[PDB]
Design a protein around this ligand. Structure first.
Ligand code: COA
Ligand code: NAP
Ligand code: KPL
Lengths: 300, 303
């Protein structure tokens, strides 16, 4: 399959490298430093598995359409990234987002009806230009957005699985994007404001209790929007924590490193969607403000 | 007036010092370290004003009943304080709480019917034993609890004003206690979680906005309980932030000392009352949990 990865950072590099190793026609689109490193010395994966590949790399999407465009930029980059890559979206090109946050698939739908949504629990970190840590193995779920099925989604899933990307197909992609966002709202909210490891959210019984309330808040918004869940967000929440007990969440890591966070597309979107249908998401709103305020305080 | 200040922390020390300077017969009842410092080197106030006075100080309640007993301890110690002082609560002794939070007056009423509720928006910090930083010059309002009037309440307000404690009398003290509780829910919640001075909550427009939402939540709970306000809690909020903008709030101070915090008596009380009338108080509930979580994380550590 011809695949362009738009956003050759941590998760984009991991997916691109695995897809390339399996023999797919892969092009990574990203930062100059990343492109130059890869073109010079290839792309190195270490951690859960160790190997080197040399996919194509460029700072700008080719005009030639791929079978698949994977969106792997941060959510605050999606709108512009699509504007800068629209030349490659052909009549038959599908766009898959494996991004956290909400609304990315909607942005892609502006350009084509051929959109899939995805969630991955793989963990990755680009530690140097051209060197990505496969920090943890996990499942990937993809589906026609917002719901239903398509032969090409099935193909993508097979390609993924053959490359060692464990992948399941869902006919409720939107449910999964929202379930992930709700889980992120709890972990990336509480863990960041308190600066604690994910496991602490379960160990302090009061944090465990408020986690449920935050999750229920997101679930109720979803339900009012007509969204249903294939897997319960609460189940996903506790499973996610159980597996990442000693980790600091990615939002907290962003702030520590002086990088922009994605909370506008997590808490922010839950809040915005709630308002549109006559609800509030007060806990999400407070977490949103606290995390953004913490960021401003640190920056300055 | 013969006045015993029960609790020799920052606010108790500030009130005791001001009342002593004015010539009142003042005794501070508190912990050994503070008591010893006051008896040895006097009580020194600095910041908003700078002066030194030497009130009496003791770890034990005097036998003689005072005209006025001022509760100034943190709210988690109100029961301990009243037990320490129970023998000096005479038939004509009034107890005034100027404490943060809700419910302190109700605890005092278990000992005597002579209870007044008080709010003060002064900001203070005990920086060394015997040395209090007056970080924000606020206002004080006192009244017969929960409502109504009494000649002695008026007399106390007169004494306070004479001593430079700017004070008004209210016939709706319970409403004032709730207004201050709502103000503290914003300041001691947001300021503590973010670990910033009070002024930052007004400076950041996004914090400003969420502050309104938190205040409204508390006001709606109060309305359901039949509480009426003489002063808009939002006005009290902005006034208080301006008057104490350089202060780190008392809850944050406790966190930094690895102490227990008062939040059970602020956010916790708002949430508990809310739930009793079928209301969530979601913002207060989250702040409650966040601050108590920080309390537990920092407990026993001095930062
Ligand atoms: S019953 C009579 C005999 N006394 C006893 O048996 C002991 C129990 N009774 C008492 O301690 C006092 O009678 C009461 C009034 C209950 C408490 O006295 P204080 O109010 O003076 O003492 P506190 O500990 O409650 O707080 C006073 C200030 O001291 C500072 N502070 C307390 N704890 C710490 C720690 N761990 N580290 C640094 N500083 C600490 C605080 O600044 C506190 O002032 P705040 O303004 O509240 O912060
Ligand atoms: N890392 C993980 O383990 C993981 C796992 C699951 C999901 N996710 C989600 O996947 C998404 C990406 O995460 P990430 O950790 O991989 O972020 P990342 O390391 O910052 O990688 C994103 C890359 O895309 C680049 N980029 C931005 N705009 C671009 C554009 N027009 N063209 C080309 N490149 C562009 C970015 O560069 P600049 O920074 O300079 O803009 C960055 O290098 C997020 O939504 C994340 O939540 C990540
Ligand atoms: C008035 C104010 C908010 C001063 O900070 C206070 O009551 C406190 O610190 O608890």
């Amino acid at each position: 399959m011809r695949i362009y990865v738009l956003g050759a950072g941590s998760i984009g590099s991991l997916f691109g490298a695995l897809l390339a190793r399996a023999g797919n026609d892969v092009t990574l689109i990203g930062r100059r430093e990343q492109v130059d490193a890869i073109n010079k010395n290839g792309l190195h994966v270490f951690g859960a598995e160790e190997f080197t590949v040399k996919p194509k790399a460029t700072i700008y999407a080719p005009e030639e359409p791929p079978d698949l465009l994977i969106l792997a930029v941060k959510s605050y980059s999606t709108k512009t990234a699509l504007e800068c890559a629209r030349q490659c979206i052909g009549r038959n090109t599908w766009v898959l987002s494996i991004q956290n946050g909400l609304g990315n698939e909607e942005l892609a739908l502006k350009y084509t009806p051929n959109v899939m949504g995805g969630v991955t629990t793989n963990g990755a970190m680009l530690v140097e230009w051209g060197k990505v840590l496969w920090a943890g193995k996990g499942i990937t779920v993809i589906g026609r957005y917002p719901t239903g099925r398509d032969d090409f989604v099935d193909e993508v899933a097979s390609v993924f699985n053959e490359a060692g990307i464990d992948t399941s197909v869902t006919e409720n992609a939107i449910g999964w994007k929202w379930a992930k966002a709700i889980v992120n709202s709890v972990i990336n909210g509480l863990g960041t404001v308190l600066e604690v490891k994910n496991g602490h959210l379960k160990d302090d019984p009061h944090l465990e209790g408020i986690s449920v309330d935050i999750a229920r808040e997101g679930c109720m918004v979803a339900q009012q929007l007509g969204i249903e869940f294939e897997i319960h967000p609460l189940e996903l929440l506790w499973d996610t924590i159980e597996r990442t007990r000693e980790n600091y969440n990615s939002t907290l890591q962003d702030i520590w490193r002086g990088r922009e966070t994605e909370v506008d597309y997590i808490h922010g979107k839950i809040v915005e969607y709630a308002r549109s249908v006559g609800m509030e998401a007060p806990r999400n709103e407070l977490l949103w403000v606290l995390v953004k305020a913490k960021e401003r305080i640190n920056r300055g």
